[PDB]
Amino acid sequence: SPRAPVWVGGWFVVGLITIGLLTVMMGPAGTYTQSGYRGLMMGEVDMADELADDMAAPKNQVPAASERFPDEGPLAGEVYVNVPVLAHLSADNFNRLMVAITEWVSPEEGCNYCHDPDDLTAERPYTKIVSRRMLEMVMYLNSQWGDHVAPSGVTCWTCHRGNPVPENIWFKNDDADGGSGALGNTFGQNAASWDAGLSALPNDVMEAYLLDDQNLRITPTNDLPMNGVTQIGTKQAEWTYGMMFHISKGLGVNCTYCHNSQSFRVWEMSPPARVTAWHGIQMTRAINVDFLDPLQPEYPANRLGPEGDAPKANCATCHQGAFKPMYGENVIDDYPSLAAPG
Amino acid sequence: AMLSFERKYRVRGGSLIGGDLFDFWVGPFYVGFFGVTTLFFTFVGVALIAYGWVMDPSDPTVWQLSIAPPDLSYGLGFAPLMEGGLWQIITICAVGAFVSWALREVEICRKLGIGFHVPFAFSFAIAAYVALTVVRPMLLGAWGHGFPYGIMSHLDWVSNVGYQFLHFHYNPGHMLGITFFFTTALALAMHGGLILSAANPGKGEKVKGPEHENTFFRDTVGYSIGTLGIHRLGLILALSAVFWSIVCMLISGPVWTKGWPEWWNWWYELPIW
Amino acid sequence: MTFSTHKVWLMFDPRSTLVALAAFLVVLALLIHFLCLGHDRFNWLEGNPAATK
Amino acid sequence: MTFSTHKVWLMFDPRSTLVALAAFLVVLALLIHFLCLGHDRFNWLEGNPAATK
Amino acid sequence: MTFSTHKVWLMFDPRSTLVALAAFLVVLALLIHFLCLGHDRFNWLEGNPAATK
Amino acid sequence: MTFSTHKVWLMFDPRSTLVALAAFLVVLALLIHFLCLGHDRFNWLEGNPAATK
Amino acid sequence: SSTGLTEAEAKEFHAVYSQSAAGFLAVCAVAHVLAWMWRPFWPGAEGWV
Amino acid sequence: MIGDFSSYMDVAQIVLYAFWIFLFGVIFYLRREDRREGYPLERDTDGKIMSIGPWNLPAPKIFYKPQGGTYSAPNAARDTRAIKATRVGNFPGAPLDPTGDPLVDGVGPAAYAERADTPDKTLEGRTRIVPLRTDADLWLAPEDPDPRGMAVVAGCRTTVGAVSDVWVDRAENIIRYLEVSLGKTVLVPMPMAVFNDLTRTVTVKSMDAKSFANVPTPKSAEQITLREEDRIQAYYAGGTLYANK
Amino acid sequence: STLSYWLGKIGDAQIGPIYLGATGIASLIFGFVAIEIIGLNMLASVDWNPVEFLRQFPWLALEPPGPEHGLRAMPPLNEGGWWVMAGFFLTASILLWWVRTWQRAKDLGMGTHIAWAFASAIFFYLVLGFIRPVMLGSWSEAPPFGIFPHLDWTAAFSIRYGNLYYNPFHMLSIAFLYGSALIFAMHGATILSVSRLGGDREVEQITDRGTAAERAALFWRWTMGFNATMESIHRWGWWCAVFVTLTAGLGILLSGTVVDNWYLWAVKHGVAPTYPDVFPGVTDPAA
């Protein structure tokens, strides 16, 4: 059969209509905000519809709080028996806090999730024991970690968001290691893991930084090597990078939110959000070391991890994909009881 | 008539505006209407870059010189001359100068009676520059999306734009462009070496012809592209590299607004598995 | 092929067939030895206890 | 192909057809063996209990 | 190949066969030596205790 | 090759064989010296104690 | 014809091919029966329990 | 510190400057190789040879050609053929105007180089470009249309003739020229021809009916020299500027 | 020696025959051992499942030893010993392939220019995998054998040594890669434009200059004021391609050995741009 010469103009029109196909197919274009200097391109790249949907998500709507009773009446420590951490609240405020906590942690299961159905005084369920340490942790976070959580504060809704198990929790060997026998060592990486943003980066970094105090500072403070300072660290850089993937995914931001890529090391070129993130790293490590990990004996086997360790919190446990938890909604002003230990 | 064989080729013709006024040479360079426009835009742009250099309060060196685009708040509008307007005017002059260079090459090709493959290939570099400074900024709604005109600051722009997606290496168009750029260097090394080996066979050997050239690659890789096929292959490789660079930058921001590694969830969670 | 199919070599070149068979057999032996090294019970150089569960 | 379709070898070259079927059979055998190795119950070298659940 | 099959060299070129065999044997020897060095009990230069567990 | 097998060089080029042997021997010596340097007991320039454990 | 074989050569090649393929399939069936007796490979409604 | 020579200088800076020296030397060497053809330069007004330093012009290198002979570069040979073009006033850079027919004279885009007056050979010493009617070991791939028999249309939409044969490169298996019998036979370079297999036509937009009648022809009808090839190709290339206008 | 219609459209249609020789067979044996090691470690990393292998192949790799092993000549297998073996066998196969290319050039009477262009890439590969880890005394500084992992290594290497954009040899290597693409597009377009004049037959144009070479030279002379010859442009391209990997090896040698922070190196030498302080009161909270 004769070969037909290619219709250049017709295929050019087809190319134009395919460009239209691409435009309708793959974007109304993302919305930009500029945080740094011009020409640097430090800022946020967000789809407007997706950002609006995440703000209008049910988890980002802090439940309405009832009017607070005047703190002048019979305390909860005399009316009730087993209230070691809430013995300074007026009984009316104690009941208001119980209702709020039920709305925040177990709205579906109701008051019976953390209480014996026929005895509110009995510390039978493990959930009551865990909730007491939850209350203590929230008070500790509000009183002692205002460098990070103020002025918004943290309540039971900040992590739990209306269900007993918070959405973003982690364990020690959260990503199953690969390799059979003497072959296939994945080295805690080389997998399509969502902890590393679906990259082949170290996906089990939360243990080194949010439970351990390992160094995230890989970049030297001098241009030339020192005699006692290490001259290597490319693989150690991958651990920091994976941790920064976790941080970026937990806040729904990019690297430029806290860094100038010209030098990831220089704080003077960094947005003031990097200072809040430093306090956040310290606070998350404190949370895991002091409250969430020592709760392992109180958990059933259904709640533990592959390594038998307690569930732990990270940047994404509170923020849930936003730069601030619930995008900055104040949650502690309505509940002064959760703002400081008694 | 500078080269020993150039006199017979210096004739009238090739103008794209239909006129003999600009048809002349200054030294080795051919001057056209588009040569004049190229020099006009070039001197304007270079003088404005020097102005922005001497008006910089930080006393930068040649490496630290930077004429930055306007803020993203100015949108697709007009900025003060010291607040992005200088970058805008230099961008307009650069686009004009590059298009004029391509059109002058078209004029030279018409005068020499050869094909327009060179202006056409340079149009791909011009399209990459335009997609970086004009098209992508309009797709994103602000001229502040273009890169600053500085030797070292445009590297910082590249770095921060890449880290806006948390791992730019995972961009599929970026992967394709890098593959094509590295393959272009591989093919250029192979071709230059083969032609130099055929033209310089050594001591006691005659200059090898097309049979030896084809035999060397059929004996090494198992396939010979030929002497006409190698140049088509090289042009195609370079043009594909630049085209995929344009695609990867036009899908970053206008299309993809999240991390690039998670785009591969289409393959990791393909409906098959 | 069988002990009596001597005419297969009127269709397959003995030299090339022997070379391809040697390459395939060496590759398969390496594969199986690596699969034995890639399992705790059958890695004879690691010397794990035979009972592995 | 059937026991009576002896004229298929008037269309396919027997030597090249046998090398493409041998290659395909070896690749298929490798794929199925690796599929068995890739699952807890049918990995005969890992030796998990048959009730993997 | 046996002590009496001297006619193999009328079918296999001695020079290329010897060079390919030398290459294969060197690669095999290097691979086995490296596999021994890659295990605790058989790295003779690291000198771990023989009782490796 | 043996002391009395002098007809090697009627099959193998003496000069090419010598150059290839020199290259192979130099590379092998470099490899084994690197092996010694890469182990604590046999790194003679680092001078660790012979008792290494 | 096209490949360059007589119908008699093709018949002999098909005879040996059919014998070899039948032997291969018989060995594969025996191996599959042996593997089923080792561990059945079609799960029930409950799985591998 | 580790890689420092002073409080400012360091090893990387010195290695960078050493590479700068090496790169500038390489560029100098490359620019010397660029001057193996066309140098020394000449003036645009009287043809006076300009003096170039011996450090910019390399010593001649000898090419031992595959079929015999030695080419040197530079070679002290200068193209001094009379150009049939004039200009008003010998001003530097003033372009020239052909006196007569620029295509036949070889002026500008029709200009050609005085190459070897012998046909190009292959490794075995047989003519590289020959018509397909002479060689039986070479045929045309059945997947591609056969140019032979196709009508030949010039740039003025006039059927000037038909394709009678194809000249094939025996060293690369590629069609180099089309032998076109004008409705008396001419060679059309294949890159200058566009094929339409549905209408069975070959369009050569670089030629008119007048230009086809003046196309240079090889001395032999089965043999073409490098100079004849060069002249014919230059004629068709100059037709892009001088034919349809 | 089969034919290929599709490849015969862009170029020639003949595929083969290929000459391997002694060094070719040796290189294939070494390289197959390396590839088997890498691929079997990748397949074992997904617990031998080919479904998971297909899912995760870009993410899979053979990983170098950790920093805890240093430059141990042969680490434990599943702790980087497989990587060291794969690197050794790949290096041996690549070196034997270089010898093969040199020999193929010699036996054809041709110059050894492709071999010495391959030597530059081999130098870069060796700096990446062997030479630099030896000087730094750590196998961990070497790239993994994986698709996405060596991109992760690339990014983490740039991050570890302070923005490799500020490495002057990285700048030079990028300039030379851009110039390789530029020069090769220039040359392909130029030769295609003079293909109507016989310009694709470049070696015949080298020993006998035709109007194609003259017009190719004059186009660039009239465009940018200077030109090359039909042979010199190939030296230009050869050197531009060689310098890519030469400067790449040079800039990787200097990272961690003599320079540990490249951005601070540029700050010392007045290369890093200084930007107006948009964030006036941000300091290190750990200071």
Ligand code: BCL
């Ligand atoms: C093994 C001995 C004979 C043979 C004996 C028979 C007999 C008897 C029959 C077939 C039938 C078929 N054969 Mg047969 N067949 C042979 C070799 C082949 C080869 C090959 C390239 O080797 C192929 C692709 C096939 C393909 C096929 C199918 C296209 C066709 C029907 C599909 C089917 O029933 O199962 C689906 C396909 C598969 C499961 C994969 C196909 C591959 C295998 C080899 C198919 C063989 C199935 C057959 C029942 C084997 C019986 C041999 C025993 C000695 C009984 N045969 C050899 C020469 N074959 C049947 C038919 O024509 O339909 C009415 C049929 O009754």
Ligand code: BCL
């Ligand atoms: C070493 C001295 C002789 C030799 C003497 C013998 C004798 C005697 C016998 C064989 C046998 C065999 N030889 Mg032999 N064989 C030689 C060289 C070779 C070469 C080669 C290219 O160098 C190869 C690939 C082989 C391969 C083989 C096998 C195909 C075959 C049995 C397989 C086997 O034992 O499994 C293991 C095979 C391998 C792991 C690969 C092969 C490697 C070595 C060289 C195989 C030698 C095995 C043989 C039993 C050792 C006997 C040598 C003693 C000095 C007697 N021989 C040289 C020329 N060989 C046996 C046979 O055919 O009987 C049915 C047998 O009885």
Ligand code: BCL
């Ligand atoms: C060194 C002096 C002689 C020599 C004298 C002998 C004598 C005597 C014998 C051999 C034997 C052998 N030789 Mg020799 N051999 C020489 C050079 C070589 C070369 C070479 C390219 O240089 C090679 C590859 C070989 C290879 C071989 C083996 C194939 C064979 C078995 C020995 C062995 O253990 O294998 C392992 C091989 C290697 C690890 C590589 C081989 C390298 C060296 C050169 C092997 C020499 C071994 C031999 C004991 C040296 C002793 C020298 C003393 C002064 C006697 N010889 C030179 C020419 N060779 C033996 C044999 O044929 O068995 C019946 C034997 O009795």
Ligand code: BCL
């Ligand atoms: C080893 C001795 C003989 C030989 C003797 C026999 C005998 C006897 C039989 C076969 C049969 C077969 N042979 Mg045979 N066969 C030989 C060489 C080969 C080669 C080869 C290229 O080396 C191949 C691919 C085959 C392939 C085959 C199969 C197609 C076929 C049955 C498949 C099978 O058994 O399942 C498993 C097959 C494989 C996993 C592929 C490998 C095949 C193996 C290597 C062949 C040996 C199997 C045989 C039963 C063992 C006899 C050897 C003893 C130690 C003496 N043979 C050599 C020349 N072969 C059978 C048949 O045709 O059925 C009617 C049969 O009865």
Ligand SMILES: CC[C@H]1c2cc3[nH]c4c(c3C)C(=O)[C@H](C(=O)OC)c4c3nc(cc4[nH]c(cc(n2)[C@@H]1C)c(C(C)=O)c4C)[C@@H](C)[C@@H]3CCC(=O)OC/C=C(/C)CCC[C@H](C)CCC[C@H](C)CCCC(C)C
């Ligand atoms: C100037 C610098 C550029 C460059 C140069 C360069 N590279 C080169 C050359 C040159 C000039 C060569 O001569 C050489 C070559 O041959 O190229 C085609 C080579 C080469 N450049 C290569 C790749 C390459 N170059 C790269 C880059 C570049 N190379 C630079 C940009 C890159 C990148 C971007 O990372 C890569 C990946 C190779 C194609 C080749 C060297 C090949 C080699 O080393 O082979 C030995 C290694 C092996 C693993 C052997 C193969 C093992 C397989 C298992 C083979 C199959 C065996 C099987 C038995 C076959 C039969 C199977 C049966 C079923 C049929």
Ligand SMILES: CC[C@H]1c2cc3[nH]c4c(c3C)C(=O)[C@H](C(=O)OC)c4c3nc(cc4[nH]c(cc(n2)[C@@H]1C)c(C(C)=O)c4C)[C@@H](C)[C@@H]3CCC(=O)OC/C=C(\C)CCC[C@H](C)CCC[C@H](C)CCCC(C)C
């Ligand atoms: C498309 C494939 C590749 C390509 C092709 C290509 N480029 C080409 C050609 C071709 C085929 C030419 O014919 C043409 C040429 O003549 O080359 C010698 C050209 C050319 N490629 C050039 C460079 C170049 N090509 C590049 C890339 C590529 N070119 C691709 C990889 C790059 C990169 C990657 O950075 C550069 C720098 C020029 C040498 C030349 C075009 C010269 C030209 O346009 O001249 C007219 C303009 C001026 C003389 C100056 C104008 C200045 C402005 C008025 C102000 C400055 C604006 C600028 C944006 C500032 C930048 C600051 C910092 C970012 C540094």
Ligand SMILES: CC(C)=CCC/C(C)=C\CC/C(C)=C/CC/C(C)=C/CC/C(C)=C/CC/C(C)=C/CC/C(C)=C\CC/C(C)=C/CC1=C(C)C(=O)c2ccccc2C1=O
């Ligand atoms: C009205 C008025 C004001 C009049 C004044 C007129 C004046 C002053 C001038 C004329 C008008 C104009 C516009 C002049 C231009 C001025 C300028 C700015 C000139 C320089 C522009 C320019 C792009 C310069 C070169 C820049 C660089 C570094 C380019 C890269 C080149 C490179 C990497 C290597 C060089 C390799 C070469 C030489 C390649 C060319 C080349 C190629 C590509 C072949 O394939 C080929 C094939 C066969 C034979 C020869 C060749 C050959 O020479």
Ligand SMILES: COC(C)(C)C/C=C/C(C)=C/C=C/C(C)=C/C=C/C(C)=C/C=C\C=C(C)\C=C\C=C(C)\C=C\C=C(C)\C=C\CC(C)(C)OC
């Ligand atoms: C199951 O698998 C089968 C069998 C099907 C085979 C398939 C295999 C497959 C699919 C393999 C895929 C492999 C891939 C995708 C590999 C990708 C690799 C990439 C991208 C690598 C990138 C960079 C790597 C570099 C630069 C590595 C360099 C390493 C070097 C130079 C190491 C040198 C080491 C030496 C010289 C060691 C010497 C030995 C000493 C001297 C130490 O001994 C003491």
Ligand code: HEC
């Ligand atoms: C788990 C998230 C709980 C839910 C659901 C409810 N309560 Fe609670 N309760 C919880 C804790 C941790 C404590 C101890 C307080 C302390 O200071 O340690 C309590 C205690 C009470 C009591 C006191 C009973 C007693 O001491 O005798 C009462 C009366 C009580 N809570 C009431 C109550 C109501 C009404 C709830 C539904 C709105 C409810 N609880 C849910 C934890 C949790």
Ligand code: HEC
């Ligand atoms: C705010 C939520 C941040 C985001 C977004 C990113 N980073 Fe991070 N970075 C942040 C802090 C608080 C710190 C200091 C941690 C400490 O222990 O001091 C850092 C530090 C780094 C570093 C190392 C700096 C050094 O001195 O070596 C690197 C390499 C780094 N950050 C990289 C990085 C990347 C790649 C990011 C995008 C994925 C990214 N950061 C985002 C806070 C925040």
Ligand SMILES: CCCCCCCCCCCCCCCCCC
């Ligand atoms: C100059 C007055 C102060 C600033 C007013 C706002 C200027 C920006 C908004 C208007 C112009 C932007 C849109 C321009 C479109 C140009 C399309 C070619």
Ligand SMILES: CCCCCCCCCCCCCCCCCC
């Ligand atoms: C001060 C630094 C000087 C650097 C000079 C570099 C010169 C490089 C020359 C390379 C080419 C040499 C000639 C090769 C001809 C072909 C040989 C087969």
Ligand SMILES: [Fe+3]
């Ligand atoms: Fe070329």
Ligand SMILES: [Mg+2]
């Ligand atoms: Mg893990």
Ligand SMILES: [Mg+2]
């Ligand atoms: Mg994890």
Ligand SMILES: [Mg+2]
């Ligand atoms: Mg966001």
